Write an enzyme that holds these catalytic residues in place. Sequence first.
Site, short mmCIF file in Angstrom:
data_model
loop_
_atom_site.label_atom_id
_atom_site.label_comp_id
_atom_site.label_asym_id
_atom_site.label_seq_id
_atom_site.Cartn_x
_atom_site.Cartn_y
_atom_site.Cartn_z
N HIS A 61 0.79 -1.24 0.00
CA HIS A 61 0.00 0.00 0.00
C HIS A 61 0.83 1.29 0.00
O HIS A 61 0.33 2.33 -0.37
CB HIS A 61 -0.89 0.09 1.30
CG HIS A 61 -2.35 0.07 1.00
ND1 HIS A 61 -3.04 1.21 0.65
CD2 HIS A 61 -3.25 -0.93 0.95
CE1 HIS A 61 -4.30 0.91 0.39
NE2 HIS A 61 -4.46 -0.39 0.56
N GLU A 253 -12.01 13.71 11.70
CA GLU A 253 -11.36 13.71 10.38
C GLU A 253 -12.22 14.54 9.43
O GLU A 253 -13.44 14.37 9.42
CB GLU A 253 -11.26 12.28 9.78
CG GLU A 253 -10.70 12.31 8.32
CD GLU A 253 -10.48 10.95 7.74
OE1 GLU A 253 -11.44 10.20 7.77
OE2 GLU A 253 -9.37 10.65 7.26
N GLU A 399 -7.33 16.25 3.32
CA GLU A 399 -7.74 15.41 4.45
C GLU A 399 -7.01 15.92 5.66
O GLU A 399 -5.81 16.26 5.59
CB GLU A 399 -7.37 13.95 4.22
CG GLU A 399 -7.99 13.39 2.99
CD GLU A 399 -7.90 11.89 3.01
OE1 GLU A 399 -6.77 11.39 3.29
OE2 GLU A 399 -8.92 11.24 2.74
N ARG A 401 -6.45 15.27 9.92
CA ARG A 401 -6.61 14.39 11.07
C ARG A 401 -5.71 14.97 12.19
O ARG A 401 -4.87 15.80 11.93
CB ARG A 401 -6.15 12.96 10.74
CG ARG A 401 -7.20 12.29 9.86
CD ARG A 401 -6.88 10.81 9.67
NE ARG A 401 -5.74 10.65 8.80
CZ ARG A 401 -5.23 9.46 8.50
NH1 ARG A 401 -5.79 8.33 9.03
NH2 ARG A 401 -4.15 9.41 7.70
C1 LIG Z 1 -2.89 2.53 0.23
C2 LIG Z 1 -3.32 3.18 1.54
C3 LIG Z 1 -2.37 3.36 2.54
C4 LIG Z 1 -2.71 4.09 3.67
C5 LIG Z 1 -3.99 4.60 3.81
C6 LIG Z 1 -4.95 4.42 2.81
C7 LIG Z 1 -4.60 3.70 1.68
C8 LIG Z 1 -5.65 3.49 0.58
N1 LIG Z 1 -4.40 5.21 4.99
C9 LIG Z 1 -3.49 5.30 6.05
C10 LIG Z 1 -3.89 5.84 7.26
O1 LIG Z 1 -5.08 6.04 7.50
N2 LIG Z 1 -2.94 6.03 8.27
C11 LIG Z 1 -1.60 5.70 8.06
O2 LIG Z 1 -0.76 6.09 8.86
N3 LIG Z 1 -1.20 5.14 6.85
C12 LIG Z 1 -2.16 4.95 5.86
N4 LIG Z 1 -1.75 4.35 4.66
C13 LIG Z 1 -0.32 3.99 4.55
C14 LIG Z 1 0.09 2.62 5.10
O3 LIG Z 1 -0.14 2.60 6.51
C15 LIG Z 1 1.58 2.37 4.87
O4 LIG Z 1 1.85 2.53 3.48
C16 LIG Z 1 1.97 0.95 5.29
O5 LIG Z 1 3.39 0.81 5.25
C17 LIG Z 1 1.37 -0.08 4.34
O6 LIG Z 1 1.55 -1.40 4.87
P1 LIG Z 1 1.82 -2.59 3.82
O7 LIG Z 1 1.68 -3.88 4.54
O8 LIG Z 1 0.99 -2.44 2.60
O9 LIG Z 1 3.39 -2.33 3.52
P2 LIG Z 1 4.20 -2.27 2.12
O10 LIG Z 1 3.72 -1.14 1.28
O11 LIG Z 1 4.25 -3.63 1.52
O12 LIG Z 1 5.65 -1.91 2.69
C18 LIG Z 1 5.96 -0.56 3.09
C19 LIG Z 1 7.30 -0.51 3.83
O13 LIG Z 1 7.11 -1.24 5.06
C20 LIG Z 1 8.08 -2.30 5.06
N5 LIG Z 1 7.60 -3.44 5.88
C21 LIG Z 1 6.50 -4.18 5.70
N6 LIG Z 1 6.51 -5.20 6.55
C22 LIG Z 1 7.63 -5.14 7.28
C23 LIG Z 1 8.22 -5.93 8.24
N7 LIG Z 1 7.67 -7.07 8.69
N8 LIG Z 1 9.41 -5.53 8.72
C24 LIG Z 1 10.02 -4.42 8.32
N9 LIG Z 1 9.48 -3.63 7.41
C25 LIG Z 1 8.30 -3.99 6.86
C26 LIG Z 1 8.30 -2.63 3.59
O14 LIG Z 1 9.54 -3.35 3.44
C27 LIG Z 1 8.40 -1.21 3.03
O15 LIG Z 1 9.64 -0.56 3.38
#
Ligand SMILES: *Cc1cc2c(cc1C)nc1c(=O)[nH]c(=O)nc-1n2C[C@H](O)[C@H](O)[C@H](O)COP(=O)(O)OP(=O)(O)OC[C@H]1O[C@@H](n2cnc3c(N)ncnc32)[C@H](O)[C@@H]1O
Length: 538
Positions: A61, A253, A399, A401
């Site tokens: 995400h 929000e 937005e 918050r």
């Molecule tokens: C797409 C989206 C995201 C989002 C949002 C609404 C939407 C439609 N609303 C949010 C909100 O209300 N509040 C908030 O703070 N964030 C919000 N987001 C963003 C979202 O929280 C972050 O993008 C989050 O990182 C997404 O998690 P996801 O599981 O999808 O992670 P990723 O994109 O694949 O990876 C992102 C980074 O995190 C690292 N990662 C992931 N897992 C681990 C572990 N186990 N250990 C270490 N690092 C980790 C990935 O490697 C990458 O660097």
Amino acid sequence: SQPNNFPAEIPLYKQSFKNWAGDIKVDDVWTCAPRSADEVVKVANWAKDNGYKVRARGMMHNWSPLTLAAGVSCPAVVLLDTTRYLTAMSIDASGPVAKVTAQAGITMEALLTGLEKAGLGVTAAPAPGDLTLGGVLAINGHGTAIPAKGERRLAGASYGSISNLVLSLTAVVYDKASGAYALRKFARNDPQIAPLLAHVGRSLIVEATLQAAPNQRLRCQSWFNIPYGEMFAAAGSGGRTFASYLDSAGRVEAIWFPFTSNPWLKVWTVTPNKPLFSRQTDKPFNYPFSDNLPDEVTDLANKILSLGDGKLTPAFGKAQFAAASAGLVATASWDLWGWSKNLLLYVKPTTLRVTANGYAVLTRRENVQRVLNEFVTFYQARVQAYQQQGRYPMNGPVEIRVTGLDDPSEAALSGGVAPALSAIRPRPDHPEWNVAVWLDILTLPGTPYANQFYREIEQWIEANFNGSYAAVRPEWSKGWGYTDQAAWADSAMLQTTIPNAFRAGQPAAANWDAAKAALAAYDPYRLFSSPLLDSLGL
Ligand SMILES: *Cc1cc2c(cc1C)nc1c(=O)[nH]c(=O)nc-1n2C[C@H](O)[C@H](O)[C@H](O)COP(=O)(O)OP(=O)(O)OC[C@H]1O[C@@H](n2cnc3c(N)ncnc32)[C@H](O)[C@@H]1O
Ligand SMILES: OC[C@H]1O[C@@](CO)(O[C@H]2O[C@H](CO)[C@@H](O)[C@H](O)[C@H]2O)[C@@H](O)[C@@H]1O
């Protein structure tokens, strides 16, 4: 080029990577799905001898390129899909504050549902449920909440980000004595954990233990009858200001569609018994007309972006407001009530795909209205300046918050440390700054003039929110460091301004440089990085 000598018992395969916004897409990235924390460590120790980076692959995400960069055919990176097997959780309620231990690939929806079944919940969390706990912790994921006037904090709850709830975590860290990466567990009162509480992608967490408080019943009321000039009026009050709801409910929000008068305001209130006319809900995602876009909206989006018809932007903002307001009325969703997770989780991934900038503005609670009114006044005047030239850079909503800071005194142990790199880490020099106002503006990816406009907004935010009035840190998951050509590309922001945001007011031993050094000591081969993390010098 297939990687050679990869651990034989861990299947390795090509799988495309595509983030939610759709603007980072890489084909055939080498990927595996570790069955256990030990398999994660096996892959790290193979990667250091073979020149591959190692990143966790959660739900993809994130907007900022923290996993890998866009436009790189088949990168020297191996992705670990933690979502398949690293999902177990357990709850220990044997102490005065309950604790939940969960593997890092679990989703926030699964985590909060597990907590609800045990009579537990959290104050705030991101709006989507389809995010991994590891991704949310990496970037200090948050929702919206500060205390209402007269509200007392529950033991085990916090008004900060999910990172502030950590009591313990297990990371993949280099063990200098053995010359290999290994699992290492850290307690929240160990200063060495500080860079890992929100490591921005510079580490790999396999499991974390978080505090959880008794679950609350929440009411979530939506309003669309308040003009933005009133909601975002100057401090000096009167009327239905955004701050008046922070005082009555604490959880607020606003989503303000472009070229429209009345924002969609959501107010969550801790409400033990269901109000007479509120609709009880026992499931999350109660705004289906926002999750499932109507043809009018998707047709206008396509005309604007794909056909270049930018002058349809005001009509597009009106269509978005219509979908939200008339959708809430049709589904009887303007006054909902139920266990907390059903109302904290409200965005599905089928919503409109957009990019976004994001900032946390630290300041005194009494200054929230001023902050909002200042931002809204500047944004409106810039939008108008661009519209005068026939340009419509911002076609999604503003937005707003508000949360508390990642204050370790809210963690249920003695001596807890603040996350070193959370955007809402406290400022020792300003104990009176006790809230963060989160500001973002959404727009379709690739909209003409978006980056130029986002740069103007970023430069003004840094100029305006300064001195003893406020300070600014970028929201890691979103866009920041803008040039007219791209986000995450401005040299001064990457090299000086952001690192300085993590030195101001902090002891040398706990500042940006100390965190960078610790993360490098924990990962001497620099397995856990991406070009952006390299450009930031983290
Ligand atoms: C797409 C989206 C995201 C989002 C949002 C609404 C939407 C439609 N609303 C949010 C909100 O209300 N509040 C908030 O703070 N964030 C919000 N987001 C963003 C979202 O929280 C972050 O993008 C989050 O990182 C997404 O998690 P996801 O599981 O999808 O992670 P990723 O994109 O694949 O990876 C992102 C980074 O995190 C690292 N990662 C992931 N897992 C681990 C572990 N186990 N250990 C270490 N690092 C980790 C990935 O490697 C990458 O660097
Ligand atoms: O939050 C209360 C809600 O949780 C449930 C389980 O979904 O009960 C949990 O919490 C209760 C209060 O602490 C405990 O009595 C029970 O053992 C625990 O499962 C619901 O039954 C309750 O309404």
